[PDB]
Design a protein around this ligand. Structure first.
Ligand SMILES: [Zn+2]
Length: 88
């Protein structure tokens, strides 16, 4: 084997008045069901990235335990998008 990677980042926008656990993205996404984490209450949602076809990748959304306000995003697979797709 040729190999797959997982990366993590934390999201939390300062500018907006209210924090949403389902916030807006630069690109569209598709959502799958949600499943619980044992020992950590906080449902983890499964999402896929939809922007422009040919994009390989899947992602999961999780909430920070430090503070419920911060969001954790785990991306698998690389993302390649066309700027015109946003318009699009
Ligand atoms: Zn993507």
């Amino acid at each position: 084997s040729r190999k797959n990677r997982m990366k993590r980042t934390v999201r939390v926008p300062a500018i907006s008045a209210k924090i949403a656990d389902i916030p807006p993205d630069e690109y569209s996404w598709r959502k799958y069901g949600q499943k619980p984490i044992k020992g950590s209450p906080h449902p983890r949602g499964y999402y896929k990235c939809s922007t422009f076809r040919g994009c390989p990748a899947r992602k999961h959304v999780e909430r920070a335990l430090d503070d419920p306000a911060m969001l954790i995003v785990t991306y698998e697979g690389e993302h390649r998008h066309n700027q015109s797709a946003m318009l699009e």
